[PDB]
Amino acid sequence: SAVQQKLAALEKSSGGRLGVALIDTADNTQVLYRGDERFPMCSTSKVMAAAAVLKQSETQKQLLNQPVEIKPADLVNYNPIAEKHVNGTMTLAELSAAALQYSDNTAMNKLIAQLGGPGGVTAFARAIGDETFRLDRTEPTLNTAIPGDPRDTTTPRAMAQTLRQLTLGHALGETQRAQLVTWLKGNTTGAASIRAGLPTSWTVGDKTGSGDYGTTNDIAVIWPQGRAPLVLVTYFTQPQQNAESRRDVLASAARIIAEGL
Ligand SMILES: *[B@@]1([O])O[C][C]([C][O])O1
Numbered sequence: 001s002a003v004q005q006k007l008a009a010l011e012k013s014s015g016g017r018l019g020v021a022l023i024d025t026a027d028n029t030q031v032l033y034r035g036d037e038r039f040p041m042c043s044t045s046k047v048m049a050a051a052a053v054l055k056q057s058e059t060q061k062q063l064l065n066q067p068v069e070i071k072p073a074d075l076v077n078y079n080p081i082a083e084k085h086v087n088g089t090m091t092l093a094e095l096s097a098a099a100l101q102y103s104d105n106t107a108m109n110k111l112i113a114q115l116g117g118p119g120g121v122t123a124f125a126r127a128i129g130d131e132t133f134r135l136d137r138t139e140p141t142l143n144t145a146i147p148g149d150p151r152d153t154t155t156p157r158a159m160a161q162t163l164r165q166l167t168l169g170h171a172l173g174e175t176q177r178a179q180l181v182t183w184l185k186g187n188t189t190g191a192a193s194i195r196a197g198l199p200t201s202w203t204v205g206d207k208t209g210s211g212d213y214g215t216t217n218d219i220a221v222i223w224p225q226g227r228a229p230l231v232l233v234t235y236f237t238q239p240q241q242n243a244e245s246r247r248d249v250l251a252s253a254a255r256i257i258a259e260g261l
Pocket of ligand 1: 208
């Protein structure tokens with residue numbers, strides 16, 4: 001299609017490797033570009049950890065209000081919210097919000113601990129039918145994004161399907177799903193990524209990710225005004241370990257997708 005030609009051209013112009021998956025929930029049609037290639041997830045993995053904790057809260061009804069102590073040893077490389085609560089507590093809800101809306105790495109590590117390790121996050125993915133997602137490490141090392149390394153990767157197609165199930169489907173209970181959507185819609189880190197390629201009238205919930213090798217990711221649910229929602233995953237990584245982030249590539253890929261609708 002035109003869109004796949006334009007995405008290929010965008011990729012060629014960027015010097016990196018671009019993966020895109022769009023699901024249009026109107027007709028369950030899909031647009032894929034490198035849809036079955038593995039990409040480092042970086043912080044887009046935080047959606048799965050938060051959702052796994054939400055799933056636990058369907059049975060442990062008070063779980064999200066459970067206080068979790070933030071100690072100095074807990075702090076890693078990027079903790080905008082956890083830093084504000086060192087030697088205090090945050091609830092699991094506050095930690096989930098921080099992981100998603102500010103990409104707080106300490107918050108993510110607390111969610112992983114709550115789940116019994118990276119294997120507990122991966123188990124949740126398997127439980128909801130995602131056989132591709134794998135979380136192997138904690139923060140910050142899950143962002144190394146080494147070419148060819150399968151650790152901490154998924155594919156665009158898999159992530160789009162899973163994000164659809166978590167936000168628009170019923171992998172989560174009704175209250176949990178609504179909470180996840182509310183958290184994604186309040187993301188603060190996404191203004192230069194998918195959102196920037198879309199009409200300002202559209203409502204977007206997203207989670208960005210960034211890592212080494214110039215890895216620049218964003219996964220989003222999109223509610224166009226008067227139209228069925230869309231799920232869009234854009235993964236991008238580059239050949240140089242110290243490459244700069246390229247959020248503009250994600251914006252451009254979204255714009256190309258939005259043109260084709
Ligand atoms: B994820 O990728 O988003 C931000 C943080 C910085 O390490 O991790």
